């Protein structure tokens, strides 16, 4: 808890630090047994009212809950794991150089058109589930069974309806297009995201193992892991793949996380 | 290893300089630096790219002055200078090209680029990821084996060492972020079929290879591993067929002697 607790001194000693390392795989819609990492073909509704996208066409937020070494044995004068640093990168960036498989020729006898278009790259590290706010491009969209979407949507949901509050608490369920991190909450999470729109924009993906992000806030306090659990969330929609017919599919990639944590004492 | 203090003295530092040439596919004796023309499969299942169409990672293993005769000393890589060699060759818009329009100049090299380099005390550790798990990769490449649909996102079975030239296709393999403790790697993918190469050169820029704790790559067996990919884009000939074009990469690494246990 960043606010419901008194945040005291950091513990030192050999056993006072730990490390989490993992991959979050993308959830682009996975329309059949061969298309992990891709969405279904994008289909365009004839009016706002008749928008009824298939579940397999909607990328979702990825989330992992990582159990940490058990501390204490409750509440009160207690120790919590605090996330201090993050290393992260997209995994498989060179796979986008496959311009020879099932593609559309750029011109006669040319190479295939590569993955391009709208991208969303997003990652978060928190001591509890990412807190979400719903915002709809079109409030009359019918979101499909099996997704968790903003309910009782009104025309105000197209700009800001404070009723649409949720926790990123399930995989393959929260569509990227209906939810964003809630800037009024998330005191115990650090989140970072970039949306690059446009149907021709090229992916620009950097990799290195030399870059670290510090997760401490203004007061030197990182995310504090309630119940000894670390929450990682990601979206890496790289753009769209185009088949020869012109049908287009979202293509996503996995994200790596390495988080360093230390023990910190808190009260209440 | 317990990593102890840096050895000082005039004999305690050394320098490695070299060029790594690109491995773009080299379809014949005239086309060093180029791939074969790119062919597009009709389905994911039938994707069977020719070896000469697949750029691969370049790697050089550089022996260093032998330490310890037969606690020991290790060479520590501290700084890197690097750049792409021959960036101005891309201004040749008059050789065998496709006119941008009637009576115009040739279309320059452009499109998807991957610029990558690593310095390590051992072979670069690789993780396999496939665009399409059903691709048939050709004889003479080293590619992710027993691929499944999970290979399209993350299959932890695909682990390799970049331990051979002209072998590891760029499109199949990335640096494994779960390893490479003893390597520093840097890469950038720029996608899109009309993206222009943007290449900087200077002899005034140094990259420091030390980590948080002030430790650079430590060269096991007195060997420095350099790896590189410099796919600059595609060349378009008049018929419209396109070929990857790559360039060499210069490395200068400064090393110092460090005691370890």
């Amino acid at each position, epitope marked *: 808890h960043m606010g419901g607790v008194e945040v005291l001194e950091v513990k030192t000693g050999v056993d006072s630090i730990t490390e989490v390392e993992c991959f979050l795989t993308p959830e682009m819609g996975d329309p059949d047994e061969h298309l992990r990492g891709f969405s279904k073909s994008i289909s365009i509704s004839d009016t706002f009212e008749s928008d009824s996208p298939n579940r397999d066409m909607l990328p979702c937020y990825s989330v992992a809950r990582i159990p940490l070494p058990n501390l204490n044995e409750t509440c009160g004068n207690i120790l919590m794991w605090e996330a201090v640093t993050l290393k992260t990168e997209v995994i498989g960036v060179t796979s986008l150089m496959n311009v020879h498989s099932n593609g559309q*020729a750029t011109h*006669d*006898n*040319g*190479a295939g058109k590569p993955v391009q278009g709208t991208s969303f790259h997003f990652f978060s590290v928190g001591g509890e589930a990412l807190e979400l706010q719903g915002v709809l491009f079109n409030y009359r969209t019918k979101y499909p069974d099996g997704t968790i979407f903003p309910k009782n949507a009104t025309v105000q949901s197209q700009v800001m309806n404070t009723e649409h509050k949720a926790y990123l608490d399930k995989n393959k369920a929260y569509p990227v297009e209906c939810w964003v991190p809630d800037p009024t909450r998330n005191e115990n999470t650090r989140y970072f995201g970039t949306l690059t729109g446009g149907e021709n924009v090229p992916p620009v993906l950097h990799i290195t193992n030399t870059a670290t992000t510090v997760l401490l806030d203004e007061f030197g306090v990182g995310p504090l892991c309630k119940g000894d659990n670390l929450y990682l969330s990601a979206v890496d929609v790289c753009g769209m793949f185009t088949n*020869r017919s012109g049908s287009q599919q979202w293509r996503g990639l996995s994200r790596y996380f390495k988080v360093q944590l230390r023990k910190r004492r808190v009260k209440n | 290893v317990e990593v102890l203090e840096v050895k000082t003295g005039v004999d305690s530092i050394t320098e490695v300089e070299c060029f790594l040439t690109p491995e773009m596919g080299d*379809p014949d004796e005239h086309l060093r630096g180029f791939s*074969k*023309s*790119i*062919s*597009i*499969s*009709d*389905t994911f*299942e*039938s994707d*069977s790219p*020719n070896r000469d169409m697949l750029p691969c990672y370049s790697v050089a293993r550089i022996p260093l002055p032998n330490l310890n005769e037969d606690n020991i000393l290790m060479w520590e890589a501290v700084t890197l200078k690097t750049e792409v060699i021959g960036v101005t060759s891309l201004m040749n818009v008059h050789s065998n090209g496709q006119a941008t329009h009637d009576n115009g100049a040739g279309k320059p090299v452009q499109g998807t680029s991957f610029h990558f380099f690593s310095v390590g005390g051992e072979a670069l550790e690789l993780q396999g990821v496939l665009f399409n798990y*059903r691709t*048939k990769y050709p004889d003479g490449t080293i590619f992710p084996k027993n691929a499944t649909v999970q290979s399209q996102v993350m299959n932890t079975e695909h682990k390799a060492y970049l331990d051979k030239n002209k072998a590891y296709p760029v499109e199949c393999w990335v640096p494994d972020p779960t390893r490479n403790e003893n390597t520093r790697y840097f890469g950038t993918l720029t996608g899109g079929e009309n993206v222009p190469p943007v290449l900087h050169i200077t002899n005034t820029a140094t990259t420091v290879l030390l980590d948080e704790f002030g430790v650079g790559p430590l060269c096991k067996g007195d060997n420095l591993y350099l790896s590189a990919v410099d796919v600059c884009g595609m060349f378009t000939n008049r*018929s*419209g*067929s*396109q070929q990857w074009r790559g360039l060499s990469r210069y490395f200068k690494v400064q090393l110092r002697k460090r005691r370890v246990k």
Partner: single-chain antibody, 235 residues
Framework: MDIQMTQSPSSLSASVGDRVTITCRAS??????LNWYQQKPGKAPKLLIS???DLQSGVPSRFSGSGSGTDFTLTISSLQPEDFATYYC?????????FGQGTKLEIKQVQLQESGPGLVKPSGTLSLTCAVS?????????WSWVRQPPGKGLEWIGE???????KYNPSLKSRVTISVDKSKNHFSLKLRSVTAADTAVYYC????????????????????WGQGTTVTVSS
């Protein structure tokens, strides 16, 4: 894409030593994706030219092809007795692969074998098998079915890859199945709800692509054919 191929003339007689040219037109542009086939009476078609102008090994150098986009020409330099045959163009640009109607010219290794019942009752299921010898099913090519009704003219039914993916002619997709069995090194055809229009010679073929360095979409041609088997619909 729906691409109709029109061939001209529909028939021609000539004398040994003559120069003959056969023309074909495509209903839309197909760039250089055009094959030519020679079919001698009662035999399977034989691939002569792939990708507008590339001669198959064994095809005598008097055969030549040219053209682009919509219009193509097959030329024989000096007619010879062995050349009496029906000649077919085929666009390889887009599935369903389509053949021209054929030009009948009158003059004055891998092995495939089709098998199955010669007779099928009306509205029954036609079933055939193609045994592949001297080559693995697991090769990097498609395994195709093509039929020729009594009035001649070739129709591509569909094809299968060793890993199980299929491509079917949209005219037959509701009633066709193609299967493959790597353990028996064969592939099969099932055609449901047959009618008299299904009476034909059925061919299995290898549809492979050609490493011709042109770039772009793979260039496919049917370079190995079975001998053909007749299936007759009768009550």
């Amino acid at each position: 894409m729906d691409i109709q191929m029109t061939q001209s003339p529909s028939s021609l007689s000539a004398s040994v030593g003559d120069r003959v040219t056969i023309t074909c037109r495509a209903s839309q542009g197909i760039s250089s994706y055009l094959n030519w086939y020679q079919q001698k009476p009662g035999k399977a078609p034989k691939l002569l030219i792939s990708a507008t102008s590339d001669l198959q090994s064994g095809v005598p150098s008097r055969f030549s092809g040219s053209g682009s986009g919509t219009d193509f020409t097959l030329t024989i330099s000096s007619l010879q007795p062995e050349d009496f045959a029906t000649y077919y163009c085929q666009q390889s640009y887009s599935t369903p692969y389509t053949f021209g109607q054929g030009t009948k010219l009158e003059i004055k290794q891998v092995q495939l074998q089709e098998s199955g019942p010669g007779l099928v009752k009306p509205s029954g299921t036609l079933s055939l098998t193609c045994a592949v010898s001297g080559d693995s099913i697991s090769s990097s090519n498609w395994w195709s079915w093509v039929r020729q009704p009594p009035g001649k003219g070739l129709e591509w039914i569909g094809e299968i890859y060793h890993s199980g993916g299929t491509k079917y002619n949209p005219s037959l997709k509701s009633r066709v199945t193609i299967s493959v069995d790597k353990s028996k090194n064969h592939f099969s055809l099932k055609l449901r709800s047959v009618t008299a229009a299904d009476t034909a010679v059925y061919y299995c073929a290898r549809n492979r692509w050609f490493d011709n360095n042109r770039g772009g979409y793979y260039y496919y041609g049917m370079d190995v054919w079975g001998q053909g088997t007749t299936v007759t619909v009768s009550s």
